[PDB]
Ligand binder design. Structure first.
Ligand SMILES: Nc1ncnc2c1ncn2[C@@H]1O[C@H](COP(=O)(O)OP(=O)(O)O)[C@@H](O)[C@H]1O
Ligand SMILES: Nc1ncnc2c1ncn2[C@@H]1O[C@H](COP(=O)(O)OP(=O)(O)O)[C@@H](O)[C@H]1O
Ligand SMILES: Nc1ncnc2c1ncn2[C@@H]1O[C@H](COP(=O)(O)OP(=O)(O)O)[C@@H](O)[C@H]1O
Ligand SMILES: [Mg+2]
Ligand SMILES: [Mg+2]
Ligand SMILES: [Mg+2]
Lengths: 65, 375, 65, 375, 375
């Protein structure tokens, strides 16, 4: 019936809408793992810098002595 | 008529005329743009014997009338025909007098400026509308979608237009009109049905076959593979019950008719499919926003009631464009009324009466004032 | 007839599945900004250490020269 | 073929290909850069049934062929298309074999280096030219003018380039490319004619409207005042006789089409008019010689056959720059052949064969040798 | 707004504006110095229709706006643009009224004194700041480093300045400005990408390619050897994912773009690389302290976020200067904010309010008072 047409339409379209909000959320989630990846990369590079820092400190230390 | 002096909202779409009052959700008087005239002369008396027949009257009297189109692909044949059909719409169908209500009209994209000047002049002289505004149907469909970013595919009955609009700004440099529309669809289907054994020329069968297109037609996911499996296809082949009662069976033609817009080489167009026309349109403009255009494409028109445009659209654009960002189409149900809805939206706000085209402005500067008053 | 009945069922079930998927995706989203924020926290702390290490290294090297 | 082993001179200008022999005054085979392909498939027999159609053959067969551009704004689509058109030019049009004649070619300004490396490699493998040289069309137009000082405005069909050269030295730091060219002109005129009531999309009407631009178009001395007086303008309004026989009348559009290059805001470019691009180009370089640049500006290209560029050019530059020194433009008649003439000039002198790009150099160092052999 | 009447600290760096309150560690409102203006005129209604667009709003609306620079290499176009952007910064971004807070500003080296006089006068008339102080960004970067000895390389977006300061005293006799900056970098990269097949002119792609410079660019350790090994370099060649989704691959260009500053002869500057400019600067002053200048060089600016400047710097200076004493560069992370930090440092101490430029001094002696009040 025409009423049946409209019923399936609103239900199916709201279904696709909900799925699509799911995937837009999933896109934000992907950009979030991205941000986490850059932050972890920066943290690891900073750790390398700090360890090199301590090594330089020691070397110049007994250079001064 | 409402006690308030609210405006008239009329969409003279290329294929359908939808008219009503401002503040209404749907147009009240909606009729196809066919016009019937007496096929022969008058000798009888007692009834009928009327020249112009419009609306459902002509639909019922299709067989006795030569069915003519006052507009085709935007071109105007006879302004008297529009005069009569507007008289019918305003008084016999809308039961309204245009004296007390300003009119908001929608026009086909890139309509002639001379056409606008002549139609406005004949309108103002013939009618007594207090005020005027005319707008492109593209921004109307945009308003119906309510999102300032996107490319509008307006598939009327005479022309298909691709228009990009970013953040509510028109991009005429990337707007194109394609001469493929319902007329072509009916023609191509006519020749295929001729190759199926049924050869008709008159307009009644034109309406029958467009009804068939409305009901049974497919948009093929893969073309040659689907005719290959449609060789026999007892289940896939589909039938229709024509009003005379004969059962007419059609198979691959269901998805071989809309394919022609996608594959124009079937009946000889240099222009490629409409997806190529959306693609070129997109690249003509700056690179960066193109992704948003990919993700914000909108389609509008009565044809859109058919299935298959969405899946075909996305798949081919993803084939042409890189598949990093996800492309999704949006199309609200019953979007052929959407333009008229947007017209009501225009009358909703209180700034709209700042730029009504009043009678005295036209009396001062002639029709030429619209050249400065709309754009 | 009956097929439309099955339709009621399948369409509603798919809609509810989409709803649950959207909710789970949003929850994972929020969790991902939580992890991004904590990663930012330790990155900022380690950078604040690194700055002083850089300063002490420069002064110590100048003293060595 | 001449008994002497004189070189080939070929200008592959962006819009026209002009080829001939060295020592000649004008190129012998001159054809537009359009390429036609069969719009449909083969079922008939007895004649035709040939894929590539180039030159006047495609011009006569425009209606039956999809008309495609193997190059647009310098970008290369399919090297096979150049292969076929060069075969046609050398054997069917020039009646010459490239085995016994070195080739001097001209390329669009700032063409891709990767484009040069690929085109040279496919050329050397496919063809058997003994020796090679390729040069920028800017210095070629300079040679045609025969004056080492000046700024060259090369208005091709895909790009317009402004290049300053002082005392026969290139100034790449002050060289710019603008994406406005014949294509844009045709497009803009297409949309205006659409607003005039005539809406066509196919390439045959593209050539018709570029012919209209060749014949009737003006360059407005004052823009808005000339549309104001062109409101009626029975005398000023001008008509054309289209080959089908209909009389198409155009008024202000004649000078509203080329104005778009001067006023890019009509169809949305951030860059201002080409006179601004010559102005900025001039000031980028040292102040002192700028006056000479003002007095030594040259313009080149097929478009230059139109009237109005000279007066507009000088007036606007004088408006922008101080009016102490007198600015004068120089433009010899039929300057679209001038580049090819300069090619002949290059072959005139006996030092030119000191730096022919021979086969063995390319065989030794691959295409990469050109990176050291031309520049 | 803080309950206390603490001063405003605003760095109007040539390329970035960073504003906030005194006593804060980092500026609160930081935005690039681009300004967007409507590319077309107004016909629509209901939203937008605003002239000036600044900050992230213009960044989001880059495509629709003509993007213009109110300052380039220190030169001032339109003071109204600064008026609007300062209004936006103070009220829409900082949410502060300048009536109750004196302002400390930083200016580009040798920002003109006449420019100082006009900007200060328009400022004092238009705004109601109680007190004023403006300083050179060189001493601000010095303060951020907190060491009175060294030569500051300020690499802004319009100019690169080399300024030597020994024991906290300025050496204008050995200070130089070079017209190479971000603009040049983008230009050179634009022409190389044009030779790579991608030719864009608009500012959106300018920002895209400067982002590419921020992400992928190298500073070549050895130039011609690295292009020789970058011939193929499948691993060394690096790609970027443009927001539209296309993958754009660049190889040697990564380290051939910053090399233009080091090797200006690529696009024609008489001045040699910036290391030569630091070298000459050093020798102009007395011999003895030159070693300290070698060992105390500092570099500042947003560009400094790129890798490779430090190693190249030291190696070339050691090549030019004797290698007895060890040369080492110092550059704290996120030093583009450092200038603003130094501004806060200026407001930290209680002697700073001894030389605030109050309203009454300007009312007495006009703008000319700054000639005696700052220097
Ligand atoms: N209910 C429907 N289902 C399918 N197709 C329809 C329906 N109503 C109209 N159409 C098609 O739409 C076409 C008219 O398009 P129209 O909506 O007038 O274009 P526009 O949007 O430019 O006004 C007709 O040719 C008809 O085939
Ligand atoms: N006789 C003519 N009169 C006017 N315009 C012409 C004529 N011949 C060619 N043109 C125009 O010149 C354009 C081609 O430019 P072209 O000379 O190929 O540029 P280039 O100098 O870079 O080779 C064509 O688009 C055409 O419109
Ligand atoms: N995070 C970043 N990484 C790399 N480069 C950057 C970054 N932020 C800004 N830049 C560059 O810095 C330039 C602006 O320099 P700026 O810091 O304003 O100079 P100044 O120190 O004179 O104010 C811009 O052109 C941009 O290319
Ligand atoms: Mg439509
Ligand atoms: Mg040219
Ligand atoms: Mg700086």
């Amino acid at each position: 019936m025409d009423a049946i047409k409209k019923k399936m339409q609103m239900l199916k379209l709201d279904k696709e809408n909900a799925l699509d909000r799911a995937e837009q959320a999933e896109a934000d989630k992907k950009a979030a793992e991205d941000r986490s990846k850059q932050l972890e990369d920066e943290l690891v590079s900073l750790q390398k810098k700090l360890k090199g820092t301590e090594d330089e400190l020691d070397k110049y230390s007994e250079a001064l002595k | 008529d409402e006690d308030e002096t609210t405006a008239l909202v009329c969409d003279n779409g290329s294929g359908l005329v939808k008219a009503g009052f401002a503040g209404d959700d749907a147009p009240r008087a909606v009729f196809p743009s066919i016009v019937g005239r007496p096929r022969h002369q008058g000798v009888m008396v007692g009834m009928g014997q009327k020249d112009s027949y419009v609306g459902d009257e002509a639909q019922s009297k299709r067989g006795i009338l030569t069915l003519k189109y006052p507009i085709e692909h935007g071109i105007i044949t006879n302004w008297d025909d529009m005069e009569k059909i507007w008289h019918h719409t305003f008084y016999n169908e809308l039961r309204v007098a245009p004296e007390e209500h300003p009119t908001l009209l929608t026009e086909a994209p890139l309509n002639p400026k001379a056409n606008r000047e002549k139609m406005t002049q004949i309108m103002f002289e013939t009618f007594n509308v207090p005020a005027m505004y005319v707008a492109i149907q593209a921004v109307l469909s945009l308003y119906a979608s309510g999102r300032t970013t996107g490319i509008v595919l307006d598939s009327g009955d005479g022309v298909t237009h691709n228009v990009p609009i970013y953040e509510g700004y028109a991009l005429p440099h990337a707007i194109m009109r394609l001469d493929l529309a319902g007329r072509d669809l009916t023609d191509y289907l006519m020749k295929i049905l001729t190759e199926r054994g049924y050869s008709f020329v008159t307009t009644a069968e034109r309406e029958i076959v467009r009804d068939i297109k409305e009901k049974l037609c497919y948009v093929a996911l893969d073309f040659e593979n689907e005719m290959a499996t449609a060789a026999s296809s007892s289940s896939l082949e589909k039938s229709y019950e024509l009003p005379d009662g004969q059962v007419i069976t059609i198979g691959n033609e269901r998805f071989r008719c809309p394919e022609t817009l996608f594959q124009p080489s079937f009946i000889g167009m240099e222009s490629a499919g409409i997806h190529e026309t959306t693609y070129n349109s997109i690249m003509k403009c700056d690179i960066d926003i193109r992704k948003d255009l990919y993700a914000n494409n909108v389609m509008s028109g009565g044809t859109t009631m058919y299935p298959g445009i969405a899946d075909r659209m996305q798949k081919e654009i993803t084939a042409l464009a890189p598949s990093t960002m996800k492309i999704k189409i949006i199309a609200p149900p019953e979007r052929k009324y959407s333009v008229w809805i947007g017209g009501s939206i225009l009358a909703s706000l209180s700034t709209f009466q700042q730029m009504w085209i009043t009678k005295q402005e036209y009396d001062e500067a002639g029709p030429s004032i619209v050249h400065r008053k709309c754009f």
